[PDB]
Amino acid sequence: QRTGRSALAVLIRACYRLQQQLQRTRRALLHHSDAVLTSLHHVRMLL
C-alpha cells in the first residue's frame, strides 16, 4: 500500500511544480522585454 502510493508522489511533485516553472518563465521574460521596448522607444524620443 505504502510502496506504490508513495512512488507516485515524486512524479506528482515534479509535474505540479513544472507547471509553475514555465509560468514563472512566462511572467519573468515578458516583464523584461517590455523594458527593452521602452528603452528603444525612449531612444526614438531623443531624436
Partner: protein, 94 residues
C-alpha cells in the same frame, strides 16, 4: 561718385525706319533712385560652428540612451542561461 565719361551728349534724330548699327541703350526705371535701397545681407547668428556644438551635444545625449538600451538588452542572454538551466536540471531529475 560720378563715373568718368569724356563725352557729354550727341544728336542725329531717331527715324524709326533708318535704324542702323544696332546698339543697345542702358534701360533704366522711371522711379527716383532713393528707393533702390541699400545692399544688406545679414548673417544667421547660429554659425557653422554653433550648429556643430548643438548637434554634437545632441549626438552625445543620444549615445547615452543607446548605451542604456544596450545594457538593458545585454542582460537577456544572462537571463536565458539563469532561468533555463535550473529547469533543465529539474527535467533531468526525472
Amino acid at each position: 561718385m560720378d563715373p568718368y565719361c569724356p563725352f557729354d551728349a550727341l544728336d542725329v534724330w531717331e527715324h524709326r525706319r533708318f535704324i542702323v548699327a544696332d546698339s543697345r541703350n542702358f534701360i533704366t526705371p522711371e522711379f527716383p533712385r532713393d528707393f533702390w535701397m541699400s545692399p544688406v545681407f545679414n548673417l544667421p547668428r547660429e554659425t557653422a560652428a554653433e550648429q556643430v556644438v548643438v548637434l554634437q551635444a545632441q549626438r552625445t545625449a543620444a549615445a547615452a540612451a543607446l548605451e542604456n538600451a544596450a545594457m538593458q538588452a545585454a542582460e537577456l542572454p544572462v537571463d536565458i542561461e539563469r532561468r533555463l538551466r535550473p529547469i533543465e536540471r529539474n527535467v533531468h531529475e526525472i
